[PDB]
Write a protein that binds this ligand. Sequence first.
Ligand SMILES: Cc1ccc2cc(C(=O)O)[nH]c2c1
Length: 167
Amino acid sequence: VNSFSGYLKLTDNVYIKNADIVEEAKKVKPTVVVNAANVYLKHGGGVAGALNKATNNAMQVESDDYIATNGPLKVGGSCVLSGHNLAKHCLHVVGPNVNKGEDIQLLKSAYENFNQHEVLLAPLLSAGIFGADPIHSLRVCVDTVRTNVYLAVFDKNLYDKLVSSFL
Ligand SMILES: Cc1ccc2cc(C(=O)O)[nH]c2c1
């Protein structure tokens, strides 16, 4: 049994809810929240900008030190950093950004990072300002992630379309 409330069950392991991931993290304090990161961990906008704002920029400060030591992530890659006030850990995952022309086949690689964690609160990778089709992102998630994933979808309209169209 876990803390997550109000989710619709899509599969054995994937759950979905219309929710602000920031407000959901603040309530649940999950072991892992996933950030929709870029390779530079520059948390300017979208989910990343919202998570970082909720940490009062501490996520960005920590991320800048990580990049200064390790260099950029790979598209499809990830790193584990602090969850600050939102979670124990933040798994920063880089999905391909279609608005940069990145290979959408890297979306499966991005979701494979979730399998290193038994339970996660996450957004749909490559959705929103990363430009991919969220319906496609949900399908890759279901077909890739085997651990227990609780997906937060900010937009109610999109939430209803994802559920109605789910096979
Ligand atoms: C967006 C949203 C807001 C409130 C709730 C409450 C639930 C629940 O108890 O099932 N789900 C929600 C989804």
